[PDB]
């Protein structure tokens, strides 16, 4: 007997910020759906995140590279927040070679086919010597949640090349979710809210796709709920 919602206009105020709307929501359902979706989105959306790095002539993050301005550790921290969308595979390996004084940005990553960067002006490091160069391989995997290096040591499985530098994976592409319910008067109805979900991601995920995915997760859990076989 209820009115079911429909996904309606997706305003996209920026590449990272987007306000989607779900219009014909019954009374009291606005808050239910809104908070459920907020929990789902903040917790479990999938994303891709650089997982390990291998720089040419360094052994561990507590070293320094002649010519670059940041210590290696700061470079890993800068990579950790590098935002990237891959399409085909579930893990790819990017190459970043560069020489010459100046910043070293995500644009400098050797363009692969399926890998798409989302803010190529992100800064990886700074070279400060004309003949200094860096050459690194960045493994990008796909996952969800937050998997620090320490636990990934569970899946150690022959990490012999001591140059391999594990960075902590923050796979989640969603940064901040908020939502407001507000009356949206259909022509003849006294109670019909409308849910506006403002959503700020790191531009690696499409807003409609994110909300659709969260709805899918919620429905698949309720699927185990709708039949109480005991």
């Amino acid at each position: 007997e209820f009115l079911k919602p429909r996904l309606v206009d997706i305003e996209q105020v920026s590449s990272t910020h987007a306000k989607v709307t779900l219009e014909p929501l019954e009374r009291g359902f606005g808050h239910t759906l809104g908070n459920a979706l907020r929990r789902i989105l903040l917790s479990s959306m999938p994303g891709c995140a650089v997982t390990e790095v291998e720089i040419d002539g360094v052994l561990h993050e507590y070293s320094t590279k002649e010519g670059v301005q940041e210590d290696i550790l700061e470079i890993l921290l800068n990579l950790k927040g590098l935002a990237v969308r891959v399409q085909g595979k579930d893990e790819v390996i990017l190459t970043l070679n560069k020489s010459g004084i100046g910043p070293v940005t995500a644009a400098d990553i050797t363009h692969d086919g399926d890998v798409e960067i989302v803010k190529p002006q992100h800064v990886i490091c700074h070279l400060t010597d004309e003949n200094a160069s860096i050459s690194m391989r960045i493994k990008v995997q796909r996952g969800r949640g937050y998997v620090p290096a320490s636990t990934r040591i569970h899946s150690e499985e022959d990490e012999r090349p001591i140059g391999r530098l594990l960075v902590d994976a923050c796979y989640s592409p969603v940064e901040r979710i908020a939502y407001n319910v507000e009356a949206a008067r259909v022509e003849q109805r006294t109670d019909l809210d409308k849910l506006v979900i403002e959503m700020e991601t790191n531009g690696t995920i499409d807003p409609e796709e994110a909300i659709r995915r969260a709805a899918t997760i919620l429905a698949e859990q309720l699927e185990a709920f709708v039949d109480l076989r005991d």
């Binding site: 808050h31 809104g34 908070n35 907020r38 929990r39």
Partner: protein, 50 residues
């Protein structure tokens, strides 16, 4: 002066805003005091005690 700084930033001069419970999304009554505190981590780390 603190109140004026808050007004300059379009924030409630009372220093207290309204919050929602992340678990249920219903609002806590009586607006709470949020802000920014400088927190240190003292070196009584727990993995040096256990």
């Amino acid at each position: 002066e603190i109140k004026e700084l808050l007004k300059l930033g379009d924030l409630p001069t009372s220093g207290q805003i309204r919050l929602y419970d992340g678990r249920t999304g219903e609002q806590f009554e009586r607006p709470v005091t949020v802000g920014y505190m400088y927190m240190l981590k003292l070196n009584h780390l727990v993995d040096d005690k256990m």
